[PDB]
């Protein structure tokens, strides 16, 4: 119940004298103001303008701009004087079971509009968190009231939506932003905000974000206000990510020295930096395909690190798994080095 007023005035809430919310500073307004996914937005606008709008399924990684996009579509489709009478938005915050489908959804989809005649819109944020039986009712509500109203389901994981609910809709994936067209946003914000940053900072910003603007701006303002300068070292310190030099030294110890000295040095650096074995495995995996290895060596290393990353999940002793990670390289590539 409720829970919309807190967000509704949480978005326009700031100190406006000291706080600097750089994520909330730059927000899209309409379809022409979201400079990304131009094919999807032009397709949706063409569907709207021909009155041939089908049931939409907006899915993808979070922060890519699904909810703001469908809010822009709803505001352009219906004016402000009839927004509340024609648009029904629900999230997973108002979860009371499967009665949400039989409650507001079934009552709203089974009646006409009140004031001005037209087709209504239903927006369902976080539809994958909905249970299987509630979705099995939502597909029937969709099937029998498709002419009067259309449904737009926003989800993060496509696999958690049943095949029938997918098959009643057309699917649109909000893919990650290619780093190129992402970089102009970063240079615009640094040129506006007067921040000292090198190109290694831009590489780190486009690497940790992996195609988003929200966490990118979060990392950028956090590193800027914590240090005053934005570089590779300061970003990976503020984020607390595995530093590239540290992973390079780890690989050097596993690739040059004997078992015991490498083990002691790695354990000392792990307790010095608080660095887990899962992130070591991920970054070493990224490192393996860049360092020129033979095919058999690359295959053996990838198999062993996949096995270790599986063993770490069930909750064994990470000390033994770390020593086995060292063993995975000592078996092949140090033998070849000795050869």
């Amino acid at each position: 119940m409720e829970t919309s007023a807190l967000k509704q005035q949480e978005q326009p809430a700031a100190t406006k004298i000291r706080n600097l919310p750089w994520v909330e500073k730059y927000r899209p307004q309409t379809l022409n103001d979201l400079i990304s996914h131009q094919d999807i937005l032009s397709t949706i606008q063409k569907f709207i303008n021909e009155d041939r709008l089908p049931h939409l399924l907006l899915y993808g990684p979070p922060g890519t701009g699904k909810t703001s996009t469908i809010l822009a579509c709803a505001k352009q489709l219906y004016k402000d004087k009839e927004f509340g009478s024609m648009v029904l938005e629900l999230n997973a915050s108002d979860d009371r079971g499967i009665d949400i489908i039989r409650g507001p959804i079934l009552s709203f989809a089974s009646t006409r509009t009140i004031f001005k005649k037209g087709f209504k819109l239903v927006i369902l944020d976080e539809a994958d968190a909905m249970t299987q039986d509630a979705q099995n009712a939502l597909r029937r509500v969709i099937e029998k009231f498709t002419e009067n109203t259309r449904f737009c389901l926003i989800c993060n994981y496509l696999s958690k939506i049943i095949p029938a609910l997918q098959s009643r809709c057309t699917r649109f994936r909000f893919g990650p932003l290619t780093p190129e067209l992402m970089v102009p946003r970063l240079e615009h914000v640094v040129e506006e905000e007067k921040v000292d940053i090198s190109e290694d900072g831009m590489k780190a910003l486009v690497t940790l974000s992996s195609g988003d603007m929200r966490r990118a701006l979060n990392i950028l303002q956090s590193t800027n206000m914590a240090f005053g300068k934005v570089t590779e070292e300061t970003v990976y310190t503020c984020t607390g990510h595995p530093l590239k030099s540290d992973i390079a030294n780890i690989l050097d110890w596993m690739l040059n020295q004997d078992f015991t000295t490498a083990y002691r040095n790695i354990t000392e650096l792990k307790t010095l930096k608080g660095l887990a074995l899962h992130d070591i495995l991920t970054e070493i995996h990224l490192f393996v395909h860049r360092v020129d290895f033979p095919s058999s060596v690359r295959i053996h290393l990838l198999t062993k690190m996949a096995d270790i990353e599986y063993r770490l999940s069930v909750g064994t002793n990470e000390k033994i798994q770390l020593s086995s990670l060292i063993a995975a390289f000592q078996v092949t590539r140090d033998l070849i080095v000795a050869e």
């Binding site: 595995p242 033994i320 000592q330």
Partner: protein, 328 residues
């Protein structure tokens, strides 16, 4: 009626935790402004992160409002994060008016001390990020972990990060001597040093084992036998017998050795831990160390999975025996 030892002699306020210099300094600076930011403590267990955050909560609030204004929660709940989020929502929704007679009114924000934050999947981590953003100016979050790399980018970027380097052996030996003289327990240095050794640099396990020993053998000295059998540590004579049995190359005495270990009620995980700790710090070749360590990792995965102890130890000792006797 009484309390366990670990929560009894923890420091009452800030600046009483030794061996830390800048963490307590920044904590005192934040407390003097009466505004604690979102805090992240990472370090190995038994270092004082929980003690530091509890001391900060006691310092900023009043002791009668200390328990009412903090909420301790763990992230390893079996029902997903829905129950955790509903508990955080219930705690943040409820507001308790407070008054301090010491002269400083209580700050409005509430404290959620969340432990084992590094055992958290990325979806749950993003849900916690949006939960913290929902209560940014009403509840300041505390995250306790050993590994900061497991926490994903947004929560790690928005939290004040503090590293806790584990204490040295001399410092924890002195603290355990203070505990022993405070609780009237007859103690030799050798017992406290052996307690430090078997706790593996964790003060919490050392304090727990000391309290367990002084309650198991009341009004008596604390020998090494009780500490060994309470900490679960395998005797070194057993480990050397295992090593000699594998070096012999005979399977029958190997079977006899593991049957003796199993029938003595010795845990297979502890035997694997001690076997690995002896193997990696010996004069074995790197190939032998590599194969033995790979088999140790596979067997430990099998044990955490829940396979049979006797068969797993038989297989690990057979691999060790073949690797050692291959050179012979």
């Amino acid at each position: 009626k009484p309390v366990p030892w670990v929560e009894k002699y923890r420091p009452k306020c800030v600046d009483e935790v030794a061996f830390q210099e800048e963490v307590v300094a920044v904590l005192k600076k934040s407390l003097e402004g009466a505004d604690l930011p979102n805090l992240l403590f990472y370090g190995p267990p038994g270092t004082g992160k929980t003690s530091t955050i509890l001391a900060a909560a006691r310092e900023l609030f009043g002791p009668e409002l200390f328990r009412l204004r903090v909420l301790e929660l763990n992230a390893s709940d079996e029902r997903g994060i829905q129950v955790v989020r509903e508990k955080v929502k219930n705690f943040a929704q409820l507001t308790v008016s407070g008054s301090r007679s010491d002269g400083k009114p209580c700050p409005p924000f509430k404290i959620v001390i969340l432990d084992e934050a590094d055992s958290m999947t990325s979806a749950a981590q993003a849900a916690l990020r949006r939960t913290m953003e929902k209560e940014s100016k009403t509840t300041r979050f505390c995250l306790i972990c050993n590994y900061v790399s497991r926490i994903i980018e947004p929560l790690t970027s928005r939290c004040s990060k503090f590293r806790f380097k584990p204490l040295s052996d001399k410092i924890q030996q002195q603290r355990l001597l203070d505990i022993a003289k405070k609780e009237n327990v007859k103690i030799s240095d050798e017992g406290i040093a052996y307690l430090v050794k078997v706790s593996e640099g964790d003060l919490r396990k050392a304090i727990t084992f000391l309290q367990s020993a002084t309650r198991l053998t009341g009004g008596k000295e604390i020998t090494e036998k009780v500490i060994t059998d309470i900490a679960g540590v395998i005797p070194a004579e057993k480990i050397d017998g295992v090593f000699a049995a594998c070096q012999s190359g005979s399977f029958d005495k190997l079977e006899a050795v593991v049957k003796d270990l199993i029938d003595e009620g010795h845990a297979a995980t502890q035997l694997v831990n001690q076997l690995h700790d002896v193997v990696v710090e010996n004069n074995l070749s790197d190939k032998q160390k590599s194969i033995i360590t790979e088999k140790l990792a596979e067997v430990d995965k099998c044990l955490a999975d829940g396979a049979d102890e006797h068969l797993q130890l038989i297989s690990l000792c057979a691999t060790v025996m073949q690797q050692l006797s291959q050179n012979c």
